Design a protein. Structure first.
Lengths: 144, 144
């Protein structure tokens, strides 16, 4: 699991990121859709591409609860169902992580040291691992 | 969360405990029912008291997966339903922990150093916290 200084950075910095949420969210989606065209179809409705505006902010909310992730399971389970419906794969998670971290770097500016960015990368990984595992079991559940 | 040496002890020792599973299970229940009469009603059927023989071994299985606890969620969810049905409370978990650790001490004998017992206490706490949180949400779900 995560070490203590990692958690401290997360707990210490997540309120900063939340305060600049609109920049995180919009930079995230701008870069996600531009740099990774292959994921655009999963967001295609039906007529502009959908941007589930709570995606990045929900990562931040999970990070707030990083020491008690079971507490967010009712939300995770509901999101997992939409993910499995949409076709989200474990291999997508590093792409979302990359663009989330790019958004975080933009917001933190000067305060964006390597250790703080590394901490957020580690935290995202742990959060992503929860969804991946829950969706893996949902996918397996579907062909019973 | 847990530190690395804790996890090492758990990963290193859980196979030892599994090998002596029958002693863990039977010492656990003997001491649980003798020292904590108030929990006997939750195990009362209907005609001897039920001993869900997999209780302690399931803690050990969770401990095996201590770095990916989401993986055991399908099992946890099913057990949580039985717990909420039976009337299991968050305040029961320290009692089960105490008698589990007593059983572990018995099996490890000489190898039962304070650091190894402390590690198992910490690990049980994290495992217990998962069930507690899942059952808390199930209890709340019931009065919607
Ligand atoms: C920890 C990582 C992630 C979190 C916290 C997260 C969170 C969310 C949230 C809150 C929603 C809106 C759910 C709703 O209210 O219905 C959503 C939807 C969606 N997410 Fe994720 N997400 C994550 C990772 C990903 C990844 C890796 C992909 C891969 C492309 C992805 C693709 C989608 C898509 C396509 C939707 C729309 C579902 C629909 O419209 O039916 N997400 N996500
Ligand atoms: C991490 C801690 C625990 C684990 C891993 C665990 C595991 C289990 C398992 C595997 C079963 C059998 C489920 C089945 O196959 O139907 C069970 C049943 C049961 N457990 Fe737990 N348990 C834990 C904590 C507790 C606590 C704290 C209590 C408090 C008294 C408790 C009381 C019971 C009772 C009364 C049953 C019987 C349910 C029934 O017969 O309907 N357990 N537990």
């Amino acid at each position: 699991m995560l070490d203590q200084q990692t958690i401290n950075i997360i707990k210490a910095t997540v309120p900063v990121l939340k305060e600049h949420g609109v920049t995180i969210t919009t930079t995230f989606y701008k870069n996600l859709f531009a740099k990774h065209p292959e994921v655009r179809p999963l967001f295609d409705m039906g007529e502009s591409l959908e941007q589930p505006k709570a995606l990045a902010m929900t990562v931040l909310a999970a990070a707030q609860n990083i020491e008690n992730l079971p507490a967010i399971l009712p939300a995770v389970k509901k999101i997992a169902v939409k993910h499995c419906q949409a076709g989200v794969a474990a291999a997508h998670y590093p792409i979302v992580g990359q663009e989330l971290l790019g958004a975080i770097k933009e917001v933190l500016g000067d305060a964006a040291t390597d250790d703080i960015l590394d901490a957020w990368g580690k935290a995202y990984g742990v959060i992503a691992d929860v969804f991946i595992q829950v969706e893996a079991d949902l996918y397996a559940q579907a062909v019973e």
